Amino acid sequence: KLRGTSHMKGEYPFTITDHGINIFPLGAMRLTQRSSNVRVSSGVVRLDEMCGGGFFKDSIILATGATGTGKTLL
Amino acid sequence: PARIAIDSLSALARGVSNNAFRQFVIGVTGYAKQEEITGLFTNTSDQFMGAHSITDSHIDTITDTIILLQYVEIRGEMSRAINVFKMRGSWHDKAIREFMISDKGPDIKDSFRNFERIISGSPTRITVDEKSELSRIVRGVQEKGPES
Amino acid sequence: EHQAIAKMRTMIEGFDDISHGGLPIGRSTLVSGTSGTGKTLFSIQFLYNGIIEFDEPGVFVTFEETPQDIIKNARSFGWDLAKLVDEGKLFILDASPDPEGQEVVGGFDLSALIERINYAIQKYRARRVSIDSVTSVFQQYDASSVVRRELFRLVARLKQIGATTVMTTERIEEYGPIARYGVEEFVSDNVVILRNVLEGERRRRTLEILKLRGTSHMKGEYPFTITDHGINIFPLGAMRLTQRSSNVRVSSGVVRLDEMCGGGFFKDSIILATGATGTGKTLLVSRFVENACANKERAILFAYEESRAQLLRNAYSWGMDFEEMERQNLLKIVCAYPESAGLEDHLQIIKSEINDFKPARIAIDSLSALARGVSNNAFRQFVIGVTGYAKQEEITGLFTNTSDQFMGAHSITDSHIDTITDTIILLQYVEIRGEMSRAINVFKMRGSWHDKAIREFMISDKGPDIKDSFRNFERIISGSPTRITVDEKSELSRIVRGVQEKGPES
Amino acid sequence: RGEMSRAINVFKMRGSWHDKAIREFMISDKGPDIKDSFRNFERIISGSPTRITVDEKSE
Ligand SMILES: Nc1ncnc2c1ncn2[C@@H]1O[C@H](COP(=O)(O)OP(=O)(O)OP(=O)(O)O)[C@@H](O)[C@H]1O
Ligand SMILES: Nc1ncnc2c1ncn2[C@@H]1O[C@H](COP(=O)(O)OP(=O)(O)OP(=O)(O)O)[C@@H](O)[C@H]1O
Ligand SMILES: Nc1ncnc2c1ncn2[C@@H]1O[C@H](COP(=O)(O)OP(=O)(O)OP(=O)(O)O)[C@@H](O)[C@H]1O
Ligand SMILES: [Mg+2]
Ligand SMILES: [Mg+2]
Ligand SMILES: [Mg+2]
Ligand SMILES: [Mg+2]
Ligand SMILES: [Mg+2]
Ligand SMILES: [Mg+2]
């Protein structure tokens, strides 16, 4: 509590390092990430063609599959 | 870095609770999203073939583009296959392709067109009279055209 | 009203509903809870409101906080108790001990205090009274039996005086005893309990009325939030089922669909769009929000999966420029991580934003996003909320739900919200010849007729294209169909040879 | 054919190339005698296969 004002409610994980306390407001970060129309290769030209030209520079790419399928390669 | 990659988020979700994982993901995800860093995350589905869900941990939603690898039982042999399941900004291919791994790398060949139930890993080969119709012996209407 | 007890209005949002009218007049209500639970706000706000809406001067007794501080803090929400104390509408009565004190004084002071309070009320002609943390008073050196007697006295003098008091109290455990000494619970006329349940790192505050000696009220815990406006409770169970229903129609942003929908969605309906990840629920919503703007209506989009930036890249790639939509002051996008608050909070942020903008169309992209980690009973209860609000407000709704398993989903929703929604538009993948193809289906419409066809649809730069169904297919829902042909080649436009042209001319 | 026959397979080899076939294999006083694959079966992995015996192309 902070009699008199507002704040963020809940627990928050922080880490004691060589630079003291470091708290990560994993709920404070805002949904204002920058997004463009740029492309980038992958290391696989054909894959680049299937994806439509290439992975966007601004994005997250996920690679699923059973053990041994070859994500580590990609 | 301009590009970051984490091999097996599936490794990090070992033991740790779900909610605590999803939190980590959102974390390493958004920091890379706002900082202009392209990132490739690796997930290993606990069960080869027959996997009914993209990720056991249900992260698939917090992602932009999904690339999927999955074994396909073909004639007593375990072959790979790849699919750009989804991409938010682009068009991307909808063909579940085959692919070999060599000393050179990943060669993405064709799709399994003559099959059914591919996603289940153990597909059903099904040509038995390919698209040329029972008229491969074209009936016999064409018996008038050539003469003397 | 049929209630043997005449109640007084707190004017705190929804408390009155929960208490079926507000506090009983001439009695005392124990409002207790742990630390930072809302006690002092409630009390303060209880006096305030009686002052601003009924000109009912009030007396506020403090045992720990300083009279300067109760004023200082009270500005946080935007009230000037100062001025009120100036007009003599609010007398603050300081009973905090001193920074340079002694030891011993809690019985003849309880008598002196009663005699004190009687005065202030007599002098200010007050009708409302608060007593903050009586607990801290016996917190000098006492035991159960001495408290009960000393409370009883105060309460009894208060009721003889005819005052409608409110006493705050502390507890240690969120679910254990109600009060500290475990005696306040039985000497009060009414008991209001405030909790700040931790549970999974987040924090949820609820308000409960255990008892009102004399009347009915709303049983159980009810969520509430503290904001720049004070306390705010949501009677998620008091929300009656008497929402208006019309036969009007509204586009879906996509024509073919509309057809499929008997003629465009109902103005008064909750719309559910399920399907595997990547099926294009997001797309559809974008069109649904767009169309309202193309017709000059206001609509909000609450996105819990995509950034406001990305939401625009993709929206443009699908044609439809959201930029303008923001400019013409017709579309308003929100964006919020579900982990950036609890359900009680998100529910209100939505409502609020729904008021400051008066949408006609609302679209929450990914309810299954909000379902992350929450207990189903807590989620279902959220859904009912947003949904309900939207229904009783004539605001069409388009909700989105993503299924945990692509292809092979034996259920519309994993949270079984199915029956809350009025219309359902389904999306899924179809492994047709080594290829993942999209298929759209209008599963159910409550008031219309809607097509019963599982049409294939392809996504393009222009957007959604609704073709035809895989008639010659069995096990379609299986995700990976089987193809049986009694025909196919059948008419439609046989005539072989050279049927086409090419890019040159036709 | 109503018999519990074994099969071996190198599922994944990180460095090497390893064979991809699912090979039949028996056991005797000599040890493991790996045989041929089930080239003409479907759903081996599942355990309860299904011979294809495709009518070739049927001429
Ligand atoms: N030099 C190579 N030549 C042919 N095939 C190879 C070669 N190296 C690896 N492979 C094949 O690729 C697979 C290796 O998988 P990969 O390293 O891509 O990562 P993964 O499947 O995502 O994760 P993990 O390595 O833990 O299994 C092997 O199962 C094997 O069949
Ligand atoms: N403007 C505000 N907006 C949002 N929250 C606020 C605001 N002002 C105060 N709060 C919150 O309200 C709480 C204040 O509690 P309050 O002073 O009403 O009584 P209490 O915690 O029940 O008892 P005590 O006075 O002993 O702490 C704090 O926990 C704080 O986080
Ligand atoms: N410009 C485009 N052209 C062709 N297809 C596109 C285009 N944009 C997106 N798509 C397709 O639509 C999908 C994007 O999904 P969409 O944003 O519509 O929401 P969703 O699938 O319902 O939910 P989520 O995006 O959270 O997975 C991609 O996977 C892709 O196949
Ligand atoms: Mg692996
Ligand atoms: Mg690996
Ligand atoms: Mg998604
Ligand atoms: Mg306190
Ligand atoms: Mg207090
Ligand atoms: Mg989405």
Side-chain angles (χ1 to χ4, degrees):
Chain A
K1 67 168 182 177
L2 286 184
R3 290 185 178 169
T5 41
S6 51
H7 59 88
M8 294 184 67
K9 290 73 175 180
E11 295 197 74
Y12 291 114
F14 66 84
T15 325
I16 288 188
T17 72
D18 273 301
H19 303 310
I21 292 172
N22 201 84
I23 315 147
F24 311 87
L26 295 179
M29 175 178 67
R30 290 183 181 179
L31 195 49
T32 310
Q33 341 287 67
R34 298 167 290 150
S35 186
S36 82
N37 238 295
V38 171
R39 307 256 183 177
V40 220
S41 190
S42 61
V44 187
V45 183
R46 196 89 181 70
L47 219 196
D48 276 88
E49 291 176 49
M50 276 151 68
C51 294
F55 305 161
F56 290 84
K57 162 183 171 294
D58 258 357
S59 67
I60 292 303
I61 317 290
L62 188 54
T64 356
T67 170
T69 49
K71 300 86 69 200
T72 296
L73 183 57
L74 281 182
Chain B
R3 286 185 176 184
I4 240 171
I6 301 177
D7 214 302
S8 180
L9 291 176
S10 71
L12 294 169
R14 283 193 235 156
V16 171
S17 89
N18 187 274
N19 299 320
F21 178 62
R22 252 166 175 172
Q23 210 180 72
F24 175 103
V25 164
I26 298 289
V28 187
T29 281
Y31 185 69
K33 217 173 195 166
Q34 66 168 49
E35 218 59 58
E36 289 307 73
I37 289 191
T38 312
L40 191 80
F41 299 77
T42 294
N43 191 69
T44 297
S45 55
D46 273 316
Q47 55 190 68
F48 70 83
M49 294 194 5
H52 276 317
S53 62
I54 267 49
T55 58
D56 303 300
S57 14
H58 308 303
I59 307 312
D60 36 354
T61 47
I62 299 79
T63 217
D64 294 302
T65 298
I66 309 178
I67 279 302
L68 175 50
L69 317 192
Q70 52 150 300
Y71 294 109
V72 179
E73 186 200 318
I74 290 290
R75 305 162 157 187
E77 293 197 55
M78 287 285 88
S79 75
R80 290 61 192 308
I82 201 167
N83 171 55
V84 164
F85 198 77
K86 79 152 191 174
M87 265 213 91
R88 275 170 187 162
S90 179
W91 146 83
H92 91 82
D93 178 15
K94 332 287 179 162
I96 312 182
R97 305 184 170 293
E98 166 153 77
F99 83 65
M100 54 113 263
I101 292 185
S102 59
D103 310 285
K104 308 179 182 184
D107 168 45
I108 296 178
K109 297 173 271 182
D110 267 325
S111 62
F112 304 73
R113 200 181 321 85
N114 35 305
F115 291 73
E116 266 182 352
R117 310 212 206 79
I118 269 178
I119 283 301
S120 57
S122 306
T124 293
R125 339 183 187 182
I126 43 75
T127 68
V128 185
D129 225 311
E130 293 170 57
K131 209 69 191 61
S132 66
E133 316 187 325
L134 173 49
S135 63
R136 85 88 188 179
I137 50 261
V138 214
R139 304 331 314 154
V141 295
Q142 171 41 267
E143 202 38 48
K144 288 83 175 184
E147 351 82 21
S148 179
Chain C
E1 186 67 70
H2 222 25
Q3 297 193 308
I5 306 295
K7 300 173 190 180
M8 169 159 102
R9 254 186 301 156
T10 65
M11 296 297 327
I12 306 188
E13 212 227 71
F15 182 92
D16 296 311
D17 276 285
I18 300 195
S19 59
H20 282 30
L23 314 189
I25 293 70
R27 293 186 163 180
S28 67
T29 293
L30 183 92
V31 168
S32 97
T34 73
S35 202
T37 64
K39 305 178 278 150
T40 327
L41 191 54
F42 198 84
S43 36
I44 281 280
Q45 196 169 333
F46 162 51
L47 294 192
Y48 186 72
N49 284 313
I51 278 179
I52 302 280
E53 301 242 347
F54 305 96
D55 197 57
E56 277 161 28
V59 160
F60 177 126
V61 181
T62 170
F63 286 111
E64 220 125 66
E65 288 182 63
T66 225
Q68 346 292 313
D69 287 300
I70 285 77
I71 295 201
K72 177 69 150 188
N73 295 333
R75 300 184 189 281
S76 188
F77 315 87
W79 316 323
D80 186 317
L81 310 178
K83 179 185 165 187
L84 300 187
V85 180
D86 247 0
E87 311 184 317
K89 293 295 190 188
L90 166 62
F91 176 78
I92 289 191
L93 155 31
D94 171 33
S96 67
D98 207 53
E100 313 183 60
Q102 146 232 174
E103 212 296 298
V104 184
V105 59
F108 243 6
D109 75 345
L110 201 296
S111 303
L113 181 46
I114 293 263
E115 265 177 52
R116 257 205 98 166
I117 305 186
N118 174 59
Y119 183 82
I121 299 182
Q122 218 185 65
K123 196 177 186 172
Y124 287 85
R125 268 175 284 161
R127 306 311 262 54
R128 306 201 182 196
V129 170
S130 308
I131 298 172
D132 216 4
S133 57
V134 291
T135 326
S136 56
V137 80
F138 336 86
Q139 279 283 302
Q140 288 188 300
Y141 48 41
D142 297 279
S144 66
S145 50
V146 196
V147 177
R148 177 163 232 170
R149 265 186 296 118
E150 292 299 353
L151 281 182
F152 186 68
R153 197 188 297 176
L154 173 65
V155 171
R157 289 295 281 92
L158 276 157
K159 174 185 305 181
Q160 299 189 312
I161 291 295
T164 300
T165 322
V166 171
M167 286 153 40
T168 237
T169 279
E170 39 224 74
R171 337 158 60 223
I172 315 293
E173 220 294 286
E174 208 77 58
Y175 283 135
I178 273 49
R180 264 191 175 280
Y181 307 73
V183 178
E184 303 72 353
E185 303 125 294
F186 317 100
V187 184
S188 299
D189 277 280
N190 321 291
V191 176
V192 169
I193 292 184
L194 295 173
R195 298 179 228 256
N196 202 172
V197 192
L198 177 50
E199 150 249 280
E201 304 210 324
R202 288 310 71 177
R203 278 278 197 184
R204 172 172 196 175
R205 31 187 36 156
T206 57
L207 176 139
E208 177 163 43
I209 306 188
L210 266 198
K211 88 159 179 186
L212 276 225
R213 278 174 170 165
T215 50
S216 67
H217 57 80
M218 300 193 77
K219 277 78 178 187
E221 291 184 291
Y222 291 116
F224 85 87
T225 313
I226 303 179
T227 70
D228 286 305
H229 278 318
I231 294 174
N232 205 80
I233 307 179
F234 303 112
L236 305 197
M239 184 166 73
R240 297 187 181 186
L241 193 62
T242 313
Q243 358 269 49
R244 289 173 282 182
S245 179
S246 78
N247 256 289
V248 184
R249 304 274 192 163
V250 218
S251 175
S252 59
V254 187
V255 207
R256 199 74 184 75
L257 222 176
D258 295 292
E259 290 170 49
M260 307 179 72
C261 272
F265 300 174
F266 274 115
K267 181 169 174 296
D268 298 6
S269 66
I270 302 294
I271 314 294
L272 180 49
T274 355
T277 174
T279 54
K281 285 93 61 185
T282 304
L283 170 54
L284 279 175
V285 167
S286 292
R287 202 84 132 202
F288 173 75
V289 113
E290 174 212 68
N291 183 298
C293 302
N295 280 287
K296 301 178 182 184
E297 306 175 303
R298 283 190 179 177
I300 315 171
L301 161 52
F302 297 82
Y304 302 76
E305 297 195 313
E306 299 186 63
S307 51
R308 351 202 180 190
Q310 201 180 306
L311 257 190
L312 256 151
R313 165 178 73 182
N314 311 334
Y316 196 97
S317 294
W318 278 319
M320 50 201 291
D321 180 324
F322 275 172
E323 268 288 58
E324 195 69 54
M325 305 279 95
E326 293 208 77
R327 306 166 198 159
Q328 288 179 289
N329 262 59
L330 288 184
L331 172 278
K332 187 188 171 182
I333 297 172
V334 175
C335 291
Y337 275 109
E339 289 71 41
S340 62
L343 272 46
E344 62 168 2
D345 296 300
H346 289 299
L347 211 234
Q348 200 189 75
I349 302 297
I350 293 189
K351 269 189 185 176
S352 185
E353 215 84 354
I354 299 180
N355 296 312
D356 321 324
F357 204 78
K358 63 72 178 166
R361 287 195 173 196
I362 205 142
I364 307 186
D365 220 330
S366 218
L367 283 167
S368 51
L370 308 185
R372 295 190 198 172
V374 174
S375 57
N376 206 292
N377 301 328
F379 177 79
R380 240 177 181 178
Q381 202 192 56
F382 168 74
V383 172
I384 306 291
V386 178
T387 289
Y389 194 57
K391 259 188 174 182
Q392 68 167 48
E393 216 62 67
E394 302 282 60
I395 296 183
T396 306
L398 182 69
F399 304 98
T400 291
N401 179 62
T402 300
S403 75
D404 274 320
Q405 72 180 72
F406 67 102
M407 299 163 47
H410 276 307
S411 26
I412 265 70
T413 313
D414 305 311
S415 45
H416 318 303
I417 319 312
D418 313 17
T419 86
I420 277 82
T421 179
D422 292 292
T423 289
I424 308 161
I425 292 292
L426 157 71
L427 296 201
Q428 53 161 311
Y429 293 102
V430 186
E431 182 197 309
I432 296 298
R433 290 153 165 160
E435 292 198 70
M436 310 263 93
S437 67
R438 291 87 202 307
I440 177 167
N441 173 48
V442 163
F443 207 60
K444 83 149 186 168
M445 260 206 144
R446 262 164 174 168
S448 178
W449 146 87
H450 88 77
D451 166 58
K452 333 277 192 184
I454 310 167
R455 310 178 168 289
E456 143 149 284
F457 80 87
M458 56 108 263
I459 302 177
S460 54
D461 313 298
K462 305 169 184 179
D465 195 9
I466 302 184
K467 282 164 272 191
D468 319 309
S469 50
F470 314 67
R471 192 184 307 82
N472 42 299
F473 277 91
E474 289 174 350
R475 289 173 69 230
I476 284 291
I477 321 287
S478 87
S480 35
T482 294
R483 17 280 197 174
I484 83 94
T485 61
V486 49
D487 66 310
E488 93 92 11
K489 161 61 181 176
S490 69
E491 18 93 66
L492 264 48
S493 55
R494 330 108 173 182
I495 273 55
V496 230
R497 290 294 184 172
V499 192
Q500 272 305 65
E501 26 79 286
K502 176 96 272 187
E505 206 176 67
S506 58
Chain D
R1 285 155 187 160
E3 281 186 34
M4 297 289 99
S5 53
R6 300 84 194 307
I8 188 168
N9 165 79
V10 193
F11 196 68
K12 81 154 181 176
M13 260 222 95
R14 274 178 170 166
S16 170
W17 140 88
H18 82 65
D19 184 33
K20 320 301 171 181
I22 305 171
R23 307 189 165 294
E24 167 151 78
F25 98 76
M26 58 133 239
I27 299 180
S28 63
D29 341 302
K30 303 185 174 201
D33 191 49
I34 308 182
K35 293 169 269 197
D36 301 301
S37 73
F38 301 98
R39 183 200 322 107
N40 36 332
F41 283 101
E42 212 160 84
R43 303 186 195 166
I44 303 179
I45 271 303
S46 73
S48 276
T50 303
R51 177 160 44 237
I52 52 83
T53 64
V54 141
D55 290 73
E56 335 146 59
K57 55 246 193 296
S58 194
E59 260 63 45

XYZ file of all heavy atoms in Angstrom, chain D residues 4 6-7 25 33 35-38 48 51 54-55:
109
model
N 3.809 -60.938 -33.110
C 4.485 -59.785 -32.521
C 5.938 -59.670 -32.997
O 6.871 -60.089 -32.300
C 4.463 -59.887 -30.992
C 3.083 -59.866 -30.364
S 2.301 -58.261 -30.466
C 1.238 -58.491 -31.884
N 9.376 -57.568 -34.108
C 10.117 -56.360 -33.711
C 10.497 -55.499 -34.916
O 10.259 -55.880 -36.061
C 11.409 -56.725 -32.961
C 11.230 -57.516 -31.678
C 11.106 -59.018 -31.938
N 10.600 -59.739 -30.768
C 11.132 -59.667 -29.547
N 12.197 -58.905 -29.324
N 10.585 -60.343 -28.540
N 11.101 -54.347 -34.639
C 11.546 -53.412 -35.663
C 12.494 -52.452 -34.982
O 12.269 -52.082 -33.845
C 10.365 -52.651 -36.235
N 13.464 -56.969 -37.373
C 14.637 -57.518 -36.717
C 14.244 -58.621 -35.740
O 13.274 -58.461 -35.003
C 15.412 -56.378 -36.033
C 15.132 -56.214 -34.555
C 15.677 -57.098 -33.619
C 14.379 -55.139 -34.096
C 15.479 -56.911 -32.261
C 14.174 -54.942 -32.736
C 14.726 -55.827 -31.818
N 19.623 -59.797 -35.252
C 19.827 -59.962 -36.671
C 18.842 -59.001 -37.324
O 17.656 -59.307 -37.462
C 19.552 -61.428 -37.048
C 19.996 -61.779 -38.464
O 21.147 -61.460 -38.841
O 19.196 -62.395 -39.199
N 16.903 -57.108 -40.118
C 16.443 -57.497 -41.447
C 16.089 -56.326 -42.363
O 16.801 -55.330 -42.416
C 15.252 -58.462 -41.298
C 15.647 -59.823 -40.673
C 14.457 -60.721 -40.249
C 14.025 -60.501 -38.783
N 13.169 -61.603 -38.229
N 14.997 -56.453 -43.098
C 14.592 -55.402 -44.014
C 13.445 -54.590 -43.435
O 12.909 -54.930 -42.384
C 14.170 -56.015 -45.354
C 15.289 -56.825 -46.018
O 16.366 -56.243 -46.295
O 15.086 -58.043 -46.265
N 13.065 -53.521 -44.124
C 11.977 -52.670 -43.660
C 10.638 -53.271 -44.035
O 10.573 -54.361 -44.600
C 12.088 -51.276 -44.281
O 11.735 -51.291 -45.656
N 9.570 -52.548 -43.710
C 8.211 -52.978 -44.023
C 7.678 -52.126 -45.167
O 6.502 -51.782 -45.200
C 7.292 -52.825 -42.799
C 7.735 -53.615 -41.605
C 8.449 -53.009 -40.586
C 7.486 -54.977 -41.524
C 8.915 -53.753 -39.507
C 7.948 -55.727 -40.452
C 8.663 -55.112 -39.442
N -0.031 -51.388 -35.166
C -0.958 -52.252 -35.898
C -1.083 -51.743 -37.335
O -2.072 -51.102 -37.708
C -2.332 -52.282 -35.206
O -2.373 -53.234 -34.142
N -1.175 -53.623 -44.488
C -0.529 -53.887 -45.765
C -1.280 -53.156 -46.877
O -2.506 -53.071 -46.851
C -0.500 -55.394 -46.034
C 0.095 -55.778 -47.381
C 0.536 -57.233 -47.396
N -0.457 -58.102 -46.773
C -0.206 -58.902 -45.739
N 1.014 -58.951 -45.206
N -1.179 -59.651 -45.236
N -1.366 -52.829 -53.111
C -1.975 -51.999 -54.150
C -2.060 -52.748 -55.478
O -1.100 -53.407 -55.896
C -1.176 -50.653 -54.333
C -1.076 -50.267 -55.809
C -1.870 -49.530 -53.566
N -3.229 -52.664 -56.118
C -3.442 -53.304 -57.416
C -2.595 -52.483 -58.383
O -3.138 -51.822 -59.277
C -4.923 -53.248 -57.839
C -5.825 -54.144 -56.989
O -6.096 -53.801 -55.814
O -6.276 -55.196 -57.500
